[PDB]
Write a protein that binds this ligand. Structure first.
Ligand SMILES: CCCCCCCCCCCCCCCC(=O)OC[C@H](COP(=O)(O)O)OC(=O)CCCCCCCCCCCCCCC
Ligand SMILES: CCCCCCCCCCCCCCCC(=O)OC[C@H](COP(=O)(O)O)OC(=O)CCCCCCCCCCCCCCC
Ligand SMILES: O=C(NO)c1ccccc1
Ligand SMILES: O=C(NO)c1ccccc1
Ligand SMILES: [Fe+3]
Ligand SMILES: [Fe+3]
Ligand SMILES: [Mg+2]
Ligand SMILES: [Mg+2]
Ligand SMILES: [Mg+2]
Lengths: 250, 253
């Protein structure tokens, strides 16, 4: 512990000091950086900042041990206690909710490819303007957050709308850093999932949309090729898609 | 420039991510680190943390452009407004202040080695228990903080006490990290100085004591060999005391 903490923290501090020496970071830049770091804490952006820049690396080590299908970062906007939904499964939406309807057909199987029943899935997403409930408190509580279960056939059908890409807020320290550094502040459109069943290893993941704006260029670096969804446009239009998740036994 | 700040911050982030990958840093470690970072801000320890681990590197690049004598980090405990001391210059001390008496003979010269008169020097130090005024609010305000001036000969004599070495306090996040990484939290004993005169570049520096513990393992990595003082023990009326001499140089603007 003492040995390991020293090793990891020492290497990180050393690497930062090597860049300071290499780039000849100035006192003026140090003072600005001090003010900025203070502002991250004052604006409660530690989880946002860290999950943008570092969670993907943490998650990549964890993923080496994956026993089911492909995983991704959680990100900072999970909220516990999202509503248990009812058939026909519909994400919490307003009567006049903007956006293109999406019907998502899900399957959850084990390592043999056998369906898993009574799997719990938490899903959350941004609305068509790229806003999350609770995070934006002008949205109705629990908008676009819910829990559903699989069938005896390991299946569910879920109606929602296609989320918009998400921008790290420009009026915060993290957004200020991204602007200052000349880096785009966008995540591609995505659906978050936490998938659990007693006796199985849980799966935290994200799904994106093939050729979506920002999918090759995620600020959070959290996309993986296995996690791209293809959409069929259906006339009546709305979009339809499907995905199979895999859980590994404990 | 966006180019420059992106280059610097990009390199830092990549470097931290390489360490995460090589050391297999876990989600549990990431969450503990998140809570730790939050605590740094909640306890107002950003200047302390950064000044412990990073200011030496910043100061070392700054120092390559020095026009005068050797410089060092400022650290986070300077407080403006210290009293102008009166002759014979004596640092603000309590009537029963403990510790060994130190007589410090200073000189300030220009880059030709000629004396500089009316140089203003701000000096601060810890007491014989390793505590700073304001920082530890139970000490009298401006204890061991004072301003003096060089005379016509560029000289001054200052009476004080030998400061103790300092531990970064474990009761805060910076000290908690040092403790958790198995690293000593000590700075060797030192006198801090900000030295200024119109038409000259200011000098920030620290002076340490040759014989002192921690000069080879400063938690802050701010010791430089030009800044080590030698002490002479003087036995004379009544009690032994210590004397030391230093010559500072300022370079013109
Ligand atoms: C863990 C703490 C490490 C902090 C190290 C301090 C030195 C940082 C040097 C970066 C200088 C960038 C130029 C800023 C000048 C401006 O100009 C003012 O402009 C701004 O909007 C604020 C600049 C953002 C500063 C970012 C600081 C990042 C901290 C280190 C990166 C974290 C990963 C490690
Ligand atoms: C600002 C940018 C900083 C980047 C943050 C990267 C997050 C990964 C850091 C990994 C640290 C491993 C700590 C091991 C541990 O579990 O240690 C956790 C112990 C238990 O709790 C502690 O009190 C120690 C907190 C460690 C905080 C280190 C963060 C410094 C980041 C480098 C500068
Ligand atoms: O939506 C996200 N999922 O990762 C996200 C949002 C902000 C910062 C990091 C991640
Ligand atoms: O030198 C110091 N005296 O204030 C100092 C430097 C870095 C961190 C803590 C203290
Ligand atoms: Fe998200
Ligand atoms: Fe000090
Ligand atoms: Mg796992
Ligand atoms: Mg200079
Ligand atoms: Mg030089």
């Amino acid at each position: 512990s003492t040995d390991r903490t020293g090793n990891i923290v020492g290497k990180m501090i050393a690497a930062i000091n090597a860049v300071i020496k290499d780039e000849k970071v100035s006192y003026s830049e140090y003072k600005a950086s001090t003010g900025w770091l203070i502002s991250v804490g004052e604006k409660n952006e530690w989880p946002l900042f860290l999950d943008v820049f570092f969670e993907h690396a943490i998650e990549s080590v964890a993923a080496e041990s994956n026993r089911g299908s492909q995983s991704s970062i959680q990100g900072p906007y999970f909220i516990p206690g999202a509503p248990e939904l009812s058939i026909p499964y519909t994400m919490p939406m307003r009567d006049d909710e903007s956006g293109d309807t999406l019907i998502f057909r899900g399957e959850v199987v084990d390592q043999e490819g056998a369906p898993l029943a009574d799997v719990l899935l938490d899903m959350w997403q941004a609305d068509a303007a790229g806003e999350y409930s609770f995070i934006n408190p002008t949205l109705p509580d629990y908008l676009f957050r819910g829990k559903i279960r699989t069938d005896e056939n390991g299946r569910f059908t879920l109606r929602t709308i296609v989320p918009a890409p998400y921008e790290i807020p420009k009026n915060g320290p993290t957004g200020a850093l991204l602007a200052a550094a000349g880096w785009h502040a966008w995540r591609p459109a995505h659906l978050h999932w936490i998938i659990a069943k007693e006796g199985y290893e849980s799966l935290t993941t994200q799904l994106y949309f093939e050729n979506g704006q920002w999918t090759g260029s995620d600020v959070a670096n959290a996309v993986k090729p296995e996690l791209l969804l293809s959409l069929d446009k259906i006339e009546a239009p709305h979009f339809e898609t499907s995905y199979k998740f895999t859980l590994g036994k404990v």
